[PDB]
Amino acid sequence: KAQEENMKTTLQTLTQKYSNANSLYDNLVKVLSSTISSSLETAKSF
Amino acid sequence: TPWSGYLDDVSAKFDTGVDNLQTQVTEALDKLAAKPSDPALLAAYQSKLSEYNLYRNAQSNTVKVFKDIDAAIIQNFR
Numbered sequence: 001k002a003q004e005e006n007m008k009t010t011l012q013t014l015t016q017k018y019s020n021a022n023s024l025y026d027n028l029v030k031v032l033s034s035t036i037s038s039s040l041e042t043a044k045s046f
Numbered sequence: 047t048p049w050s051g052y053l054d055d056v057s058a059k060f061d062t063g064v065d066n067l068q069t070q071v072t073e074a075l076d077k078l079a080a081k082p083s084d085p086a087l088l089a090a091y092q093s094k095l096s097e098y099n100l101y102r103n104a105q106s107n108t109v110k111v112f113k114d115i116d117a118a119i120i121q122n123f124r
Contacts (some may be wrong), residue, residue: 044088045078 053109053116060105093108 050058074094077087 038083041083044092046092
């Protein structure tokens with residue numbers, strides 16, 4: 001059972017890496033500012 | 047030979063003052079027609095377009111004011 005709780009905590013670490021991957025991907029998808037914030041440059045063409 | 051009065055001379059002086067302003071605007075607008083967001087021509091687009099606008103306004107106002115002076119002189123004969 002000690003070995004099995006070690007396996008279970010390994011699986012818990014891999015699952016909890018949701019907060020390590022999706023959490024930062026949610027604001028990594030904010031590279032779209034390169035589209036929106038570079039679309040307010042219409043002042044260059046008035 | 048192509049005749050040119052003083053007002054025509056002033057207009058030609060403005061045309062020869064700018065090298066290829068009409069042409070420069072032409073290629074700037076043509077280049078922007080396919081690359082709308084790109085730098086170094088968008089700013090060039092706005093600068094050349096404003097340059098052309100001020101050029102045309104200056105030419106029109108100068109010929110108008112010289113015409114006003116000349117008309118005053120001609121009318122003042124009598």
